[PDB]
Amino acid sequence: GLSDGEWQQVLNVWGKVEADIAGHGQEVLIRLFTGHPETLEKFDKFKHLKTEAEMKASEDLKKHGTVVLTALGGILKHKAHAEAELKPLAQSHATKHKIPIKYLEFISDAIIHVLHSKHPGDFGADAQGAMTKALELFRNDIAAKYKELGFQG
Amino acid sequence: GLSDGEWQQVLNVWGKVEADIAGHGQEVLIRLFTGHPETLEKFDKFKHLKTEAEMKASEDLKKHGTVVLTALGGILKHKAHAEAELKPLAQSHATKHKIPIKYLEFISDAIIHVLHSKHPGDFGADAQGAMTKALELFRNDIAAKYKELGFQG
Ligand code: HEM
Ligand code: HEM
Ligand SMILES: [Co+2]
Ligand SMILES: [Co+2]
Ligand SMILES: [Co+2]
Ligand SMILES: [Co+2]
Ligand SMILES: [O]
Ligand SMILES: [O]
Known part of the structure; x- marks a missing residue:
């Protein structure tokens, strides 16, 4: 996995995400759906959407964006903390x-x-x-x- | 991996450990060193101690027991928490x-x-x-x- 360094870089940019989680969430999903239209077909509540302007107008697409990045941000934050806690124990037990x-x-x-x-x-x-x-x-x-x-x- | 109930069973018993971490740490190391005497050879401070009565009398052994179970408890409680966020996401995205x-x-x-x-x-x-x-x-x-x-x- 990552260095303590690599994780702080991840958590630092994540702090910027958290300043406007809906804005980021919306952009990620629009970038996903535009780049890979087959992903949109998986979302029963979004798959009717046919224009960039319709995707931006969707109140619920923006709410779903928040849901995704909030869940992911939680997971990355727990992974960074758990890795930093395990690494030292592994290193002493392995090297000394x-x-x-x-x-x-x-x-x-x-x-x-x-x-x-x-x-x-x-x-x-x-x-x-x-x-x-x-x-x-x-x-x-x-x-x-x-x-x-x-x-x- | 563990089910949601299994992780709570882990947390519930670990609460009883932390209630008397010194006593649990002592009993764990005594069980390790009496069940697997070769493991005692790793510990400069304990490797001369022959009997459970001597092991129980060793403030250093009891001190090390607290360190070990403190470290492991941190890791278990974090893994319980992380998995409990992750498993439902995996379950919903694979099955639903x-x-x-x-x-x-x-x-x-x-x-x-x-x-x-x-x-x-x-x-x-x-x-x-x-x-x-x-x-x-x-x-x-x-x-x-x-x-x-x-x-x-
Ligand atoms: C970073 C990746 C992802 C995260 C963190 C994530 C997280 C979530 C969460 C938290 C939910 C609501 C709770 C749940 O159903 O489990 C959700 C619902 C859902 N996700 Fe994901 N998701 C991700 C990726 C994807 C991808 C790539 C797709 C589709 C191509 C997808 C499709 C859905 C669907 C269809 C729902 C149900 C939406 C509804 O309520 O109508 N997810 N996702
Ligand atoms: C649940 C498993 C284990 C945990 C959580 C654990 C945790 C720790 C911790 C926190 C330390 C002190 C800091 C460090 O040096 O990393 C330590 C030291 C040590 N551990 Fe472990 N340990 C485990 C298993 C073992 C086993 C099975 C052995 C040997 C058979 C071992 C041998 C040692 C030794 C020799 C030290 C240095 C002792 C000293 O000089 O005071 N550990 N361990
Ligand atoms: Co650049
Ligand atoms: Co959490
Ligand atoms: Co009970
Ligand atoms: Co921690
Ligand atoms: O999602
Ligand atoms: O240990």
């Missing part, structure tokens, strides 16, 4: 501590054991299955960063 | 709206054009390359969720 993925499986199993032991009424089979999958996603995230740094975990 | 990944590539191109045209002083070649990579990461995350839902992309 050199913790294989097998060891991360071991501590994952230990966490599942302690939660089962301590919180049975908040950790029956479905909840334990949830946590098992969540810690696997965490290990996969570390693994992916391990390989970018060319460490064999 | 029927939007190919290729179309996500088209709206990404449109976002990059509108940013470059409106904010060139915030969208030089480095910033444009960052945003291009950021939107590819987004589409990759939607394509992963599609594939889980059995949608061809």
